[PDB]
């Protein structure tokens, strides 16, 4: 079998993307955030919390044939970003872009930090990191891929992620007229229960490639680039009038500024990372101080190739028995 879905911005900045999800019978369709960061798919529900659904849709097990409450489970979960969310568990049947998962782990919230509750365009997330990440308690549940693996026609799926448009998740074959040139395949170490992999170096802009290994993971739930300090320095000293402000957390540049590519590298090939996709825009609305895409890691404990990275490549999370990750250029 195979799937395809179509993934969409969430805002003008692509600072996350929601991709939609068929769940129960009848189908109630949610928009989930598909996060190779996480291992649990968690919904927006008829149990969470009244006064944190704002705008969400919701998940109601009790209007679908096919749910069952996994007897005495919980889930409880914290993201590097400091939100969070917690509840009971379900199983029921779970279909993306045409791939259907019967007894698949439905993560019902009771409970969603507020930066859940402030997004009303994201009813959930959908983990597609390793399953031995997962939060349930006490038995473990397995990721939506994890389930899906054995049925697929490969043990993959695809990130094709759009800069300000839509773009693609695939599961269980790799579309060829979807990347130019030749896909680099790179070793996964999957002991932290990411897809954890090494990138051979960097370029700032037209300047020379500087090859030096850098740790960290593929994730789709993370918006920005995160990577050590000397290199994020190295980048915006490119761009005048740069600086880190503690205030806002992190470097910002003048909205006036064209930003210079970034260059990062999978074995011997070459991922380029657009100016423009490192701008986020206005700090506060009417500002001419605009926030980075690439900021550092120092402190997260470990570098982050999120979206700004990975919407610049045709990524392949290659879930074969010894797992790997690839990119091409697109």
């Known amino acids: 079998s195979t799937g395809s879905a179509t993934t969409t911005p969430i805002d003008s900045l692509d600072d996350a993307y929601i991709t939609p999800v068929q769940i129960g019978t009848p189908a109630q369709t949610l928009n989930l955030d598909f996060d190779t960061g996480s291992s649990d798919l968690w919904v927006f529900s008829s149990e969470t919390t009244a006064s944190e659904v704002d705008g969400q849709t919701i998940y109601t097990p009790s209007k679908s044939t096919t749910a069952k409450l996994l007897s005495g489970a919980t889930w409880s979960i914290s993201y590097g970003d400091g939100s969070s969310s917690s509840g009971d568990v379900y199983t029921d049947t779970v279909s993306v872009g045409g791939l259907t998962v019967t007894g698949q782990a439905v993560e019902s919230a009771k409970k969603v930090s507020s930066s859940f509750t402030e997004d009303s365009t994201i009813d959930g997330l959908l983990g597609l990191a390793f399953s031995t990440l997962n939060t349930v308690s006490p038995t473990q549940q397995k990721t939506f891929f994890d389930n899906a693996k054995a049925s697929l026609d490969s043990p993959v799926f695809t990130a094709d992620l759009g800069y300000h448009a839509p773009g693609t998740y695939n599961f269980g074959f790799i579309d060829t007229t979807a990347y130019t040139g030749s896909i680099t395949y790179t070793a996964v170490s999957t002991k932290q229960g990411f897809w954890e992999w090494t990138s051979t170096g960097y370029a700032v802009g037209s300047g020379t490639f500087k090859s030096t290994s850098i740790d960290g993971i593929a994730d789709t739930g993370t918006t920005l680039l995160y990577l050590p300090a ?23 540049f003048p909205c006036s500024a064209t930003l210079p590519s970034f260059t990062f590298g999978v074995g011997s090939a070459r991922i380029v990372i657009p100016g423009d996709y490192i701008d986020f825009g206005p700090i506060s609305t009417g500002s001419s101080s605009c926030f980075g895409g690439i900021q550092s890691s120092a402190g997260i404990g470990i570098n982050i190739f999120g979206d700004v990275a990975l919407k610049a490549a045709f990524v392949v999370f290659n879930g074969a028995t010894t797992p790997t990750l690839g990119f091409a250029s697109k």
């Open 230 to 252: 000397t290199v994020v320095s190295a980048y915006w000293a490119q761009v005048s009038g740069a600086k880190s402000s503690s205030s806002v957390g992190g470097y910002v």
